[PDB]
Amino acid sequence: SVLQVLHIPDERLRKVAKPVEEVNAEIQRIVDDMFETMYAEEGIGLAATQVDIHQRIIVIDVSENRDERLVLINPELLEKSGETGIEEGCLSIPEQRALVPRAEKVKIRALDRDGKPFELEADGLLAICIQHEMDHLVGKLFMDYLSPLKQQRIRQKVEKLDRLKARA
């Protein structure tokens, strides 16, 4: 199923996710719906909280043939180093982009879709994508890093878009 993705300024985007107790068929259903939603909207990363599910689940696929599915359940950052930034986007903040400071290289531990643990060292776009997604789970958005003026302007832009989006 394709789930509805929440937009700012929804308060549900600020909720802190609870860890997944046990990776069972219900959780795997959520993971599959999340991938389906992400591809449908053509994103490359999705956090559970963006679809108003407040558990520590993230799906990522940066691939062209939509066939390098990455699932992070209960992710934990073990190490990070360096500093980078690209102009990030987000399906919850339609059509807005901004450069945000991130660590360059990241090492995480997580469970996969089967509930098996794994470690992953990432750099480049993957490292940035994992940080951006891990932020969602503690109620952080990429605009939180920007100046008050920049944040206000982004909110308006999105409110204007959702206002036209429904043409009645």
Q: Which residues bind Fe ion (CB under 5 A)?
A: 90
Nearest residue to Fe ion on Cβ basis: 90
54 is in an annotated binding site: no
Known active-site residue 133 = yes
DSSP assignment string, 20-57? PS---HHHHHHHHHHHHHHHHHT-SEEEGGGGT--BSE
> Is residue 82 within 8 Å of 104, Cβ to Cβ?
yes
What is each CA distance from 143 to 7, 82, 88, 151, in whole angstroms? 13, 21, 10, 6
Q: How far is the CB of 126 from Fe ion (least distance, A)?
A: 15
Q: How far is the CB of 38 from Fe ion (least distance, A)?
A: 10
129 is in an annotated binding site: no
Return the bridge partners of 98, or none.
88
Choose between 38 and 90: whose C-beta lies nearer to Fe ion. 90
Choose between 30 and 90: whose C-beta lies nearer to Fe ion. 90
Residue labelled with tokens 């003026």: 149
Element (H, E) at 154: helix 148-165
Q: How far is the CB of 133 from Fe ion (least distance, A)?
A: 7
From the list 79, 83, 121, 133, the catalytic residue is 133
Q: How far is the CB of 8 from Fe ion (least distance, A)?
A: 10
Return the bridge partners of 80, or none.
106
Choose between 90 and 127: whose C-beta lies nearer to Fe ion. 90
7 is in an annotated binding site: no
Which residues are annotated as part of the binding site? 90, 132, 136
Q: Annotated active-site positions, please? A: 133
Which residues are annotated as part of the binding site for Fe cation? 90, 132, 136
